[PDB]
CSV table of C-alpha atoms and ligand atoms in Angstrom, one decimal:
chain,number,residue,atom,x,y,z
A,1347,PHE,CA,116.1,120.7,72.1
A,1348,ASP,CA,115.9,118.6,68.9
A,1349,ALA,CA,113.8,118.8,66.2
A,1350,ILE,CA,111.0,117.3,65.7
A,1351,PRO,CA,112.2,115.4,62.6
A,1352,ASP,CA,114.8,113.9,64.6
A,1353,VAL,CA,112.5,112.8,67.5
A,1354,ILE,CA,110.3,111.0,64.8
A,1355,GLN,CA,112.9,109.5,63.9
A,1356,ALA,CA,114.5,107.9,67.1
A,1357,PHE,CA,111.1,107.1,68.3
A,1358,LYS,CA,110.5,105.3,65.2
A,1359,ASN,CA,113.7,103.3,65.7
A,1360,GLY,CA,112.2,102.2,69.1
A,1361,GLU,CA,113.8,104.4,71.1
A,1362,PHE,CA,112.4,106.2,74.7
A,1363,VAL,CA,112.3,110.3,73.3
A,1364,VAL,CA,112.2,113.0,76.3
A,1365,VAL,CA,109.0,115.6,76.2
A,1366,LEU,CA,108.4,118.2,78.0
A,1367,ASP,CA,104.6,119.9,78.0
A,1368,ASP,CA,104.2,124.0,78.6
A,1369,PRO,CA,105.8,125.1,81.3
A,1370,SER,CA,102.0,127.3,82.2
A,1371,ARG,CA,100.5,124.1,82.1
A,1372,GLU,CA,102.3,120.6,84.0
A,1373,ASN,CA,106.0,121.4,83.5
A,1374,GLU,CA,107.3,117.9,83.3
A,1375,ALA,CA,108.5,115.4,81.2
A,1376,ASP,CA,107.7,112.3,80.4
A,1377,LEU,CA,109.7,109.7,79.0
A,1378,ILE,CA,107.8,108.5,76.0
A,1379,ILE,CA,107.9,104.6,73.9
A,1380,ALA,CA,106.2,103.0,71.5
A,1381,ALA,CA,104.9,100.7,72.9
A,1382,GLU,CA,104.4,97.8,70.3
A,1383,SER,CA,107.9,96.5,71.4
A,1384,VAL,CA,109.0,98.2,74.2
A,1385,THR,CA,111.4,95.7,75.5
A,1386,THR,CA,111.7,94.4,79.5
A,1387,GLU,CA,114.8,95.8,79.9
A,1388,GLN,CA,113.6,99.2,78.9
A,1389,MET,CA,110.5,99.1,81.1
A,1390,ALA,CA,113.1,97.9,84.1
A,1391,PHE,CA,114.8,101.8,83.1
A,1392,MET,CA,112.0,103.6,82.5
A,1393,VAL,CA,110.3,102.0,86.0
A,1394,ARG,CA,113.4,103.0,87.8
A,1395,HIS,CA,113.5,106.7,86.6
A,1396,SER,CA,110.1,107.7,86.4
A,1397,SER,CA,106.7,107.9,89.0
A,1398,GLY,CA,106.1,104.2,87.9
A,1399,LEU,CA,103.1,105.1,87.4
A,1400,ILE,CA,103.8,103.4,83.6
A,1401,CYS,CA,100.4,104.4,81.0
A,1402,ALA,CA,99.8,103.2,77.6
A,1403,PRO,CA,98.4,106.8,75.4
A,1404,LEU,CA,96.0,105.2,72.8
A,1405,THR,CA,93.2,106.3,70.0
A,1406,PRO,CA,89.7,106.5,71.0
A,1407,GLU,CA,89.7,103.6,68.2
A,1408,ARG,CA,91.8,101.5,70.5
A,1409,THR,CA,89.8,102.3,73.4
A,1410,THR,CA,87.0,100.6,71.7
A,1411,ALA,CA,88.1,98.3,70.2
A,1412,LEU,CA,89.8,96.6,73.4
A,1413,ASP,CA,86.5,97.4,75.1
A,1414,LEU,CA,88.2,100.0,77.5
A,1415,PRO,CA,86.1,102.4,79.4
A,1416,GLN,CA,86.7,105.7,81.0
A,1417,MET,CA,87.9,104.3,84.9
A,1418,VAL,CA,85.3,107.3,86.3
A,1419,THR,CA,82.2,108.4,84.2
A,1420,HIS,CA,82.5,112.0,86.3
A,1421,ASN,CA,86.2,113.2,85.7
A,1422,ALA,CA,87.8,115.2,88.5
A,1423,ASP,CA,91.2,114.8,87.4
A,1424,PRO,CA,92.0,118.9,86.5
A,1425,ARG,CA,93.5,118.4,83.0
A,1426,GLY,CA,90.7,115.9,81.8
A,1427,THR,CA,93.6,112.6,81.7
A,1428,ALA,CA,92.0,109.8,80.3
A,1429,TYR,CA,92.1,107.3,82.5
A,1430,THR,CA,90.8,103.8,81.6
A,1431,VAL,CA,89.8,100.8,83.2
A,1432,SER,CA,93.7,99.5,84.3
A,1433,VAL,CA,94.7,96.0,82.7
A,1434,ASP,CA,97.9,93.3,83.0
A,1435,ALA,CA,98.1,90.9,79.6
A,1436,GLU,CA,96.7,87.9,80.0
A,1437,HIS,CA,99.3,85.3,79.0
A,1438,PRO,CA,101.0,82.0,80.7
A,1439,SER,CA,104.2,84.6,81.2
A,1440,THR,CA,102.5,87.0,83.5
A,1441,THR,CA,102.4,86.5,87.5
A,1442,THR,CA,101.5,89.2,89.3
A,1443,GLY,CA,101.1,91.9,86.7
A,1444,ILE,CA,104.3,94.2,88.0
A,1445,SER,CA,107.4,93.5,87.1
A,1446,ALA,CA,109.2,95.0,84.2
A,1447,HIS,CA,109.1,92.0,81.8
A,1448,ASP,CA,104.7,92.2,83.1
A,1449,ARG,CA,104.0,95.8,82.2
A,1450,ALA,CA,106.5,95.7,78.9
A,1451,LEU,CA,104.3,92.2,78.2
A,1452,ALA,CA,101.1,94.8,78.7
A,1453,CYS,CA,102.3,97.4,77.0
A,1454,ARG,CA,103.0,95.2,73.6
A,1455,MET,CA,99.4,93.4,74.0
A,1456,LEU,CA,97.8,96.8,73.8
A,1457,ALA,CA,100.1,97.4,70.2
A,1458,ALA,CA,99.5,93.4,69.3
A,1459,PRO,CA,97.8,94.3,65.3
A,1460,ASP,CA,95.3,91.5,66.3
A,1461,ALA,CA,94.5,92.5,70.2
A,1462,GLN,CA,90.9,92.1,71.6
A,1463,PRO,CA,89.5,92.2,74.5
A,1464,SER,CA,89.9,89.2,76.0
A,1465,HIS,CA,93.6,89.5,75.7
A,1466,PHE,CA,93.6,92.6,79.1
A,1467,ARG,CA,92.6,91.6,82.2
A,1468,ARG,CA,91.0,94.6,84.8
A,1469,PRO,CA,91.9,95.9,86.8
A,1470,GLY,CA,95.9,95.7,86.3
A,1471,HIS,CA,99.0,97.2,86.9
A,1472,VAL,CA,99.2,99.0,83.2
A,1473,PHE,CA,97.0,102.7,82.9
A,1474,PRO,CA,96.2,102.7,79.5
A,1475,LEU,CA,94.8,106.8,78.7
A,1476,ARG,CA,92.5,107.6,76.3
A,1477,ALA,CA,94.1,110.8,73.8
A,1478,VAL,CA,91.7,113.3,72.5
A,1479,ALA,CA,90.4,113.0,68.6
A,1480,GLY,CA,91.8,115.8,67.7
A,1481,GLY,CA,95.7,115.2,68.9
A,1482,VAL,CA,98.0,117.1,70.6
A,1483,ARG,CA,96.9,120.4,68.6
A,1484,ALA,CA,93.9,119.9,70.9
A,1485,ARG,CA,94.9,118.9,74.4
A,1486,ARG,CA,98.5,119.5,74.8
A,1487,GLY,CA,99.6,116.8,77.1
A,1488,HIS,CA,101.5,114.0,77.3
A,1489,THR,CA,99.0,111.5,76.3
A,1490,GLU,CA,98.7,113.0,72.7
A,1491,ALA,CA,102.2,113.6,72.4
A,1492,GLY,CA,102.7,109.9,72.4
A,1493,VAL,CA,99.8,109.2,70.0
A,1494,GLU,CA,101.2,112.1,67.9
A,1495,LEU,CA,104.9,110.4,67.5
A,1496,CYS,CA,103.0,106.9,67.0
A,1497,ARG,CA,101.2,108.2,64.1
A,1498,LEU,CA,104.5,110.5,63.0
A,1499,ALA,CA,107.0,107.6,63.0
A,1500,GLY,CA,104.6,105.1,61.4
A,1501,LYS,CA,104.0,102.7,64.5
A,1502,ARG,CA,101.0,101.0,66.2
A,1503,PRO,CA,98.0,103.9,67.8
A,1504,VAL,CA,100.0,103.0,71.2
A,1505,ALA,CA,102.5,104.4,73.0
A,1506,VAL,CA,104.0,104.5,76.7
A,1507,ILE,CA,104.4,107.5,78.8
A,1508,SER,CA,105.7,108.1,82.9
A,1509,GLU,CA,106.8,111.4,84.2
A,1510,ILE,CA,110.7,111.8,85.3
A,1511,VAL,CA,110.8,112.4,89.4
A,1512,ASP,CA,113.3,114.2,90.4
A,1513,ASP,CA,113.9,111.4,93.6
A,1514,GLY,CA,116.7,114.0,95.5
A,1515,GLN,CA,119.4,112.3,97.1
A,1516,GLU,CA,119.8,108.7,98.9
A,1517,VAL,CA,120.7,109.1,103.1
A,1518,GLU,CA,122.8,106.2,103.8
A,1519,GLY,CA,121.2,103.8,105.9
A,1520,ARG,CA,117.5,105.8,106.3
A,1521,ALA,CA,114.4,105.1,104.3
A,1522,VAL,CA,114.2,108.5,103.1
A,1523,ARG,CA,115.4,111.3,99.9
A,1524,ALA,CA,117.0,114.4,100.7
A,1525,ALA,CA,115.1,116.9,98.5
A,1526,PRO,CA,112.6,114.9,95.7
A,1527,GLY,CA,110.7,116.3,93.3
A,1528,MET,CA,109.8,116.4,89.6
A,1529,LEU,CA,112.8,116.7,86.9
A,1530,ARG,CA,112.6,120.5,85.4
A,1531,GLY,CA,113.8,122.2,82.3
A,1532,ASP,CA,117.6,122.5,81.6
A,1533,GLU,CA,117.6,119.2,84.1
A,1534,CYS,CA,115.4,116.6,81.4
A,1535,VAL,CA,117.5,118.3,78.6
A,1536,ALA,CA,120.7,117.0,80.3
A,1537,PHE,CA,119.2,113.4,81.6
A,1538,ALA,CA,118.0,112.9,77.7
A,1539,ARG,CA,122.0,113.1,77.3
A,1540,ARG,CA,123.1,111.3,80.0
A,1541,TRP,CA,120.7,108.7,78.5
A,1542,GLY,CA,121.4,108.9,74.7
A,1543,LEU,CA,118.0,110.6,73.8
A,1544,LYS,CA,116.3,112.5,72.3
A,1545,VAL,CA,114.4,115.4,74.0
A,1546,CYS,CA,111.5,117.9,72.6
A,1547,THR,CA,108.3,120.6,73.9
A,1548,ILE,CA,104.6,119.6,73.1
A,1549,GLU,CA,105.0,122.9,71.0
A,1550,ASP,CA,107.8,122.2,68.7
A,1551,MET,CA,105.8,119.3,68.1
A,1552,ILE,CA,102.2,121.5,67.5
A,1553,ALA,CA,104.3,123.5,65.6
A,1554,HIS,CA,105.4,120.9,63.2
A,1555,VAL,CA,102.1,119.1,63.0
A,1556,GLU,CA,101.0,122.9,62.3
A,1557,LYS,CA,103.2,122.7,59.0
A,1558,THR,CA,100.4,119.9,57.6
A,1559,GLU,CA,97.6,120.6,59.5
A,1560,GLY,CA,97.4,124.7,59.9
A,1561,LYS,CA,96.4,125.9,63.4
A,1562,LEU,CA,93.3,124.2,65.5
B,1357,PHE,CA,112.7,87.5,110.1
B,1358,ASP,CA,111.7,90.1,113.1
B,1359,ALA,CA,109.1,88.8,115.2
B,1360,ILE,CA,105.9,90.5,114.9
B,1361,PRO,CA,105.7,92.5,118.0
B,1362,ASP,CA,109.2,93.7,117.2
B,1363,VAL,CA,107.3,95.0,113.3
B,1364,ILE,CA,104.6,95.7,115.1
B,1365,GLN,CA,106.5,98.9,117.2
B,1366,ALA,CA,108.4,100.0,114.3
B,1367,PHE,CA,105.5,100.7,112.0
B,1368,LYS,CA,104.2,102.0,115.0
B,1369,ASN,CA,107.1,104.6,114.9
B,1370,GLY,CA,106.3,105.6,111.3
B,1371,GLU,CA,108.2,103.7,109.8
B,1372,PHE,CA,108.6,101.2,106.7
B,1373,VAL,CA,107.8,97.7,107.9
B,1374,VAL,CA,109.3,94.6,104.7
B,1375,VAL,CA,106.3,92.3,104.5
B,1376,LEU,CA,106.8,88.7,102.0
B,1377,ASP,CA,103.6,87.3,101.2
B,1378,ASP,CA,103.7,83.2,100.8
B,1379,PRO,CA,106.6,81.9,98.0
B,1380,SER,CA,103.3,80.1,97.3
B,1381,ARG,CA,101.5,83.1,96.7
B,1382,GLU,CA,103.3,86.2,94.8
B,1383,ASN,CA,106.1,85.8,96.5
B,1384,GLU,CA,107.3,89.7,96.5
B,1385,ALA,CA,107.9,92.0,99.7
B,1386,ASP,CA,105.9,95.6,100.0
B,1387,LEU,CA,107.2,98.5,101.7
B,1388,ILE,CA,104.6,98.8,104.1
B,1389,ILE,CA,103.8,102.0,106.3
B,1390,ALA,CA,101.4,104.0,108.0
B,1391,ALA,CA,99.8,106.5,105.8
B,1392,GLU,CA,98.3,108.9,108.3
B,1393,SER,CA,101.8,110.6,108.7
B,1394,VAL,CA,104.1,109.8,105.7
B,1395,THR,CA,106.5,111.9,104.3
B,1396,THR,CA,107.6,113.5,101.2
B,1397,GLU,CA,111.1,112.7,101.8
B,1398,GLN,CA,109.5,109.1,102.7
B,1399,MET,CA,107.6,108.6,99.5
B,1400,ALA,CA,110.2,109.8,97.3
B,1401,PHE,CA,112.4,106.5,99.0
B,1402,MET,CA,109.2,104.5,98.5
B,1403,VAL,CA,109.0,105.4,94.7
B,1404,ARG,CA,112.8,105.5,94.1
B,1405,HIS,CA,112.9,101.7,95.8
B,1406,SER,CA,109.7,99.9,94.5
B,1407,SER,CA,107.5,99.7,91.5
B,1408,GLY,CA,106.2,103.5,92.0
B,1409,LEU,CA,102.3,102.1,91.7
B,1410,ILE,CA,101.6,103.5,95.2
B,1411,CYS,CA,98.8,102.0,96.8
B,1412,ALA,CA,96.9,102.8,100.2
B,1413,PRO,CA,95.0,99.9,102.0
B,1414,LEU,CA,91.8,100.6,103.8
B,1415,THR,CA,89.0,99.6,105.4
B,1416,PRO,CA,85.6,98.8,103.8
B,1417,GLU,CA,84.3,101.7,106.4
B,1418,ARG,CA,86.8,103.4,105.1
B,1419,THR,CA,85.7,103.3,101.6
B,1420,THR,CA,82.3,103.9,102.2
B,1421,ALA,CA,83.5,106.5,104.7
B,1422,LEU,CA,85.1,108.2,101.3
B,1423,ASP,CA,83.1,107.0,98.9
B,1424,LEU,CA,85.6,105.0,97.2
B,1425,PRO,CA,83.7,102.3,95.3
B,1426,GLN,CA,85.6,99.8,93.1
B,1427,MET,CA,87.4,100.8,90.2
B,1428,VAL,CA,85.6,97.5,88.2
B,1429,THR,CA,82.1,95.7,89.2
B,1430,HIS,CA,83.2,92.6,88.2
B,1431,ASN,CA,87.2,91.9,89.1
B,1432,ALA,CA,89.5,90.2,86.7
B,1433,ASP,CA,91.9,90.5,89.2
B,1434,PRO,CA,93.4,86.6,90.1
B,1435,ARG,CA,93.5,87.8,93.7
B,1436,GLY,CA,91.0,89.9,93.8
B,1437,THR,CA,92.8,93.1,94.0
B,1438,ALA,CA,90.6,95.3,95.2
B,1439,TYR,CA,90.8,98.6,93.8
B,1440,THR,CA,89.1,101.7,94.4
B,1441,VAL,CA,88.8,104.5,92.3
B,1442,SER,CA,92.6,106.2,92.0
B,1443,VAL,CA,92.6,109.9,93.9
B,1444,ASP,CA,94.6,113.1,93.8
B,1445,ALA,CA,94.2,115.4,97.5
B,1446,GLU,CA,92.0,118.7,97.0
B,1447,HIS,CA,94.6,120.7,98.4
B,1448,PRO,CA,96.2,124.3,97.9
B,1449,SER,CA,100.1,122.4,97.6
B,1450,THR,CA,98.6,119.9,94.8
B,1451,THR,CA,100.1,120.1,91.8
B,1452,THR,CA,100.0,117.8,89.4
B,1453,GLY,CA,99.3,114.8,91.6
B,1454,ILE,CA,102.5,112.3,91.0
B,1455,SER,CA,105.0,114.0,92.8
B,1456,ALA,CA,106.5,112.4,96.4
B,1457,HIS,CA,105.2,115.8,97.6
B,1458,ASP,CA,101.8,115.0,96.2
B,1459,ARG,CA,101.4,111.8,96.7
B,1460,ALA,CA,101.8,111.6,100.4
B,1461,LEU,CA,99.7,114.2,101.2
B,1462,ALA,CA,97.2,111.6,99.1
B,1463,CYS,CA,98.0,109.1,101.6
B,1464,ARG,CA,98.0,111.6,104.9
B,1465,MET,CA,94.9,112.7,103.6
B,1466,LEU,CA,93.1,109.7,103.4
B,1467,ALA,CA,94.5,108.4,107.0
B,1468,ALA,CA,92.9,112.0,108.5
B,1469,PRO,CA,90.4,111.5,111.0
B,1470,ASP,CA,88.2,114.5,109.7
B,1471,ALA,CA,88.9,112.9,106.8
B,1472,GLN,CA,85.8,113.0,103.4
B,1473,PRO,CA,85.1,112.3,100.6
B,1474,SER,CA,85.4,116.1,98.7
B,1475,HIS,CA,89.0,115.9,100.2
B,1476,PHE,CA,89.7,113.5,97.2
B,1477,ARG,CA,90.0,113.9,93.3
B,1478,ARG,CA,89.5,110.9,90.9
B,1479,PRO,CA,90.8,109.6,89.4
B,1480,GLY,CA,94.0,110.5,90.7
B,1481,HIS,CA,97.7,108.8,91.3
B,1482,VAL,CA,97.3,107.1,94.3
B,1483,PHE,CA,95.3,103.9,94.8
B,1484,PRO,CA,93.5,102.7,97.2
B,1485,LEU,CA,93.3,99.0,97.9
B,1486,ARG,CA,90.0,97.8,99.8
B,1487,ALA,CA,90.7,95.2,102.6
B,1488,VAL,CA,88.5,92.5,102.7
B,1489,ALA,CA,86.9,92.4,106.2
B,1490,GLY,CA,87.8,89.0,108.1
B,1491,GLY,CA,92.0,91.1,108.0
B,1492,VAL,CA,95.1,88.6,106.8
B,1493,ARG,CA,93.3,84.9,108.7
B,1494,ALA,CA,91.1,86.1,105.3
B,1495,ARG,CA,93.5,87.2,102.7
B,1496,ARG,CA,96.8,86.9,102.6
B,1497,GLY,CA,97.5,89.7,100.9
B,1498,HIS,CA,99.9,92.7,101.0
B,1499,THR,CA,96.6,94.7,101.7
B,1500,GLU,CA,95.2,92.9,104.4
B,1501,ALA,CA,98.7,92.7,106.6
B,1502,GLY,CA,98.8,96.4,105.5
B,1503,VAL,CA,95.0,97.4,107.2
B,1504,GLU,CA,96.5,94.7,110.4
B,1505,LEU,CA,100.0,95.8,110.8
B,1506,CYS,CA,97.6,99.8,111.4
B,1507,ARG,CA,95.0,98.4,113.8
B,1508,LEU,CA,98.1,96.3,115.9
B,1509,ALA,CA,100.3,99.3,115.6
B,1510,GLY,CA,96.7,101.6,117.1
B,1511,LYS,CA,97.1,104.1,114.0
B,1512,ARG,CA,94.4,105.3,111.3
B,1513,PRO,CA,93.1,102.4,109.6
B,1514,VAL,CA,95.1,103.7,106.2
B,1515,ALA,CA,98.6,101.4,105.3
B,1516,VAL,CA,100.5,102.9,101.7
B,1517,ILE,CA,102.2,99.9,99.9
B,1518,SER,CA,104.2,99.2,96.8
B,1519,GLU,CA,106.2,96.3,95.9
B,1520,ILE,CA,110.0,95.8,95.5
B,1521,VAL,CA,111.8,95.8,92.6
B,1522,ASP,CA,114.7,94.1,91.3
B,1523,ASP,CA,115.8,97.2,89.1
B,1524,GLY,CA,118.7,95.1,87.5
B,1525,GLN,CA,121.6,97.1,86.6
B,1526,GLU,CA,122.3,99.8,85.0
B,1527,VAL,CA,124.3,100.0,81.6
B,1528,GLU,CA,125.9,103.0,81.3
B,1529,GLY,CA,124.7,105.7,78.7
B,1530,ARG,CA,122.3,102.8,77.8
B,1531,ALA,CA,118.0,103.6,78.5
B,1532,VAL,CA,117.5,99.8,79.5
B,1533,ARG,CA,118.8,97.8,82.7
B,1534,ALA,CA,119.7,95.1,83.1
B,1535,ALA,CA,118.6,91.6,84.3
B,1536,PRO,CA,115.2,93.2,86.3
B,1537,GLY,CA,113.3,91.1,88.3
B,1538,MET,CA,111.7,91.6,91.5
B,1539,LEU,CA,113.1,91.1,94.9
B,1540,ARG,CA,112.4,87.8,96.6
B,1541,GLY,CA,113.3,86.0,99.8
B,1542,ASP,CA,117.0,86.6,101.2
B,1543,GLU,CA,117.5,89.4,99.2
B,1544,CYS,CA,114.2,91.2,100.1
B,1545,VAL,CA,115.7,90.7,104.5
B,1546,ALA,CA,119.2,92.1,103.5
B,1547,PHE,CA,117.2,94.8,101.6
B,1548,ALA,CA,115.8,95.5,105.1
B,1549,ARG,CA,118.6,95.5,107.0
B,1550,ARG,CA,120.5,97.6,104.6
B,1551,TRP,CA,117.8,100.1,105.0
B,1552,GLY,CA,117.9,99.5,109.0
B,1553,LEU,CA,114.2,98.2,108.1
B,1554,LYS,CA,112.3,95.6,110.0
B,1555,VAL,CA,111.3,92.5,108.2
B,1556,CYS,CA,109.0,90.2,108.3
B,1557,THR,CA,106.2,87.2,106.6
B,1558,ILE,CA,102.8,87.5,106.4
B,1559,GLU,CA,102.7,83.8,107.1
B,1560,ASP,CA,103.9,85.1,111.0
B,1561,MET,CA,102.0,87.9,111.0
B,1562,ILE,CA,98.9,85.7,110.9
B,1563,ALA,CA,100.5,83.4,113.3
B,1564,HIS,CA,100.7,86.4,115.6
B,1565,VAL,CA,97.0,87.3,114.8
B,1566,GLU,CA,95.7,83.4,116.0
B,1567,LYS,CA,96.9,84.2,119.4
B,1568,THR,CA,94.6,86.3,119.8
B,1569,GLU,CA,91.4,85.2,117.4
B,1570,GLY,CA,92.5,81.1,117.0
B,1571,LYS,CA,92.4,80.0,113.5
B,1572,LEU,CA,89.9,81.0,110.7
C,1369,MG,MG1,100.1,92.1,93.5
C,1370,MG,MG1,102.0,114.7,81.8
C,1371,MG,MG1,99.9,114.9,85.1
C,1372,MG,MG1,101.0,92.2,96.8
């Protein structure tokens, strides 16, 4: 795995980074990138290689500023993933909200310094996620990891995340993929290397933060 | 395009069908399949070739039976896409809810004859969509088209849909895809042919239904 300072620099440079949570938690790797300048072409890559459920981790302060309430008042998710109501960008260039162009635009608009509630149509096709106030030390999730990277890299407090799936194998002429799943551990590292990305664990990210904050 | 009776037969056989809405509406093609027996391997194919925002069109009667309220009370979507709260399957085999296995399971459970509200965790990673009571003649959307195909094919009243994107081109060693977009018209037909699927338009589906119901 790469050292956290090196992951931070790549993130500050607007690159995706590959982040693995604990094997005892989801044991999944997500692509994580700063939302502020995610490009159409980057989003297309993200959609191609992930589950396609493109989420946007943001702080509680941003969910209040942008008027993004939780999708459900009584959260039945076992991890408590804090989905807000979904959004599309209110912009003349938006069409159906689902294209790489449109999803990237929604993410950049969520991160804009001048963002306001009226800039988003609800419901939509991008899923903001409310990070907990305590950050990665408090909840060891990809939501917190994305917001933490934004803070560490001096970026706007909105990230973009999605899980890296194992799409299995193509079957010529048949609408199925054999042996699909989720990418794990070493394969996630190999994926990062193939695409020129840094890769790390939330555990190491927490160790980095503890250098300044101590153990929660 | 294939004739609607032939599309119906393929759908009855548990295949995906490719359905295009009007060029004046979204001008998009979706993969549409009956939810009742969608397999893990089919779902992996669907995720690989679509936006990855896997939705499950169902009837108003099913949204009441399964206790799936609309995600937003004041819908700001320009088409009124009727998203309910999202779900994951409450089953011992579910892990994080996002894998092809887990998403396919949620879809099959939504379609089960014995389905009940407690069978779904909210929020989650599959997005049910409430078709309007009037069907395709009333709202010419992919949501209605999926429910209409289930009715026409004698299937349970729950479909699975997602938009077919244009993932653009791979760029060796770089985390971007060039020139991405949405698949359109002839390219959608070509996609169907490559994968052994039937392809049609919502306009022809409405013409089929009008043979029995007349024009709305
Ligand atoms: Mg749409
Ligand atoms: Mg996660
Ligand atoms: Mg998760
Ligand atoms: Mg549609």
